[PDB]
């Protein structure tokens, strides 16, 4: 499965600088989303990839940035 | 309401170096990613540089790499760009602004940034 | 290289309570990645939408945005005198982010 990461508690997108390849964005959805992880800047937002499919992604159903 | 703080602008001569500062207020500094833009009096906008939450993604103009760059202070709610080899052609307002994952969803009053001999 | 935006027309002379067609047009599809400001003399840029169309929060429903690809429109139902300031639009899809010239809506 793949997605935005989304930050839990606020359920807002994490913001990346450099599109495409990206290293925040690839440790940032291995560290939520585990070791398997994929990830890459896409329109400025932290898209994660290699998602265990029971994966939470963005958006929230509950929760706006 | 939320609110950004920019200080730190003034004259120079070329060569020279300043560093800006915006401060926030109104939300979570640390929950953002920031970024510095600038305004030549008269023009345009342009967008200068830009930091990740947890300073961990960086990037800069292409008019200013090498010569810009931009940190934060989360624990001081404060963003920070240090400015060298100032050149003519980077007299302009500099605005501090939120994030707003592609667009900039809150900008500051700006403050002025003069090179000239 | 770098993504070229046209906002047309350059300066828009206009009354109070009638309305205003703001036009931007990307140089190749920026998809939906458009954002709309405002910016009123002797202030900062105020975001009034994003993602070409979605409004940001506080904006009156007077202001519209719309278009997608390379044809992007704002449109002011009715101007308000707080609605006379410059309108700077800006695409996201690629690398690095640029900003139109902006359109001034002045009075006559």
């Known amino acids: 499965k793949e997605g935005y990461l989304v930050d839990k508690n606020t359920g807002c997108k994490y913001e990346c600088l450099k599109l495409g390849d990206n290293d925040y964005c690839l440790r940032e959805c291995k560290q939520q989303y585990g070791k398997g992880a994929g990830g890459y800047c896409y329109a400025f937002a932290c898209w994660c990839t290699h998602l265990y499919e029971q994966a939470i992604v963005w958006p929230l159903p509950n929760k706006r940035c | 309401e939320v609110q950004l703080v920019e200080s730190g602008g003034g004259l120079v001569q070329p060569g020279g170096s300043l560093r800006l500062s915006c401060t926030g207020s109104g939300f979570t500094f640390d929950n953002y990613a920031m970024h510095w833009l600038r305004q030549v009096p008269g023009e345009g906008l342009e967008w200068v540089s830009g930091?990740?939450?947890?300073?961990?993604?960086?990037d800069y103009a292409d008019s200013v790499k090498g010569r810009f760059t931009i940190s934060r202070d989360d624990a001081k709610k404060t963003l920070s760009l240090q400015m060298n080899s100032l050149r003519a052609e980077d007299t302009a307002v500099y605005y501090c602004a939120r994030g707003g994952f592609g667009s900039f969803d809150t900008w500051g009053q700006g403050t002025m940034v003069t090179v000239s001999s | 290289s770098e993504i070229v935006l046209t906002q047309s027309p350059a300066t828009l002379s206009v009354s109070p309570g009638e309305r205003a067609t703001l036009s931007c047009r990307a140089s190749q599809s920026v998809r939906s990645y458009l954002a709309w400001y405002q910016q009123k003399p002797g202030q900062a840029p105020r975001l009034l939408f994003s993602?070409?169309?979605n409004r940001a929060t506080g904006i009156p429903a007077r202001f519209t945005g719309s278009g997608s690809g390379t044809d992007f429109t704002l449109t002011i139902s009715s101007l308000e005198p707080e609605d006379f300031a410059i309108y700077y639009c800006?695409?996201?899809?690629?690398?690095?982010?640029?900003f139109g010239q902006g359109t001034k809506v002045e009075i006559k």
């Open positions: 800006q695409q996201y899809r690629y690398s690095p982010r640029t």
């Open positions: 993602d070409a169309s």
């Open positions: 930091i990740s939450r947890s300073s961990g993604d960086i």
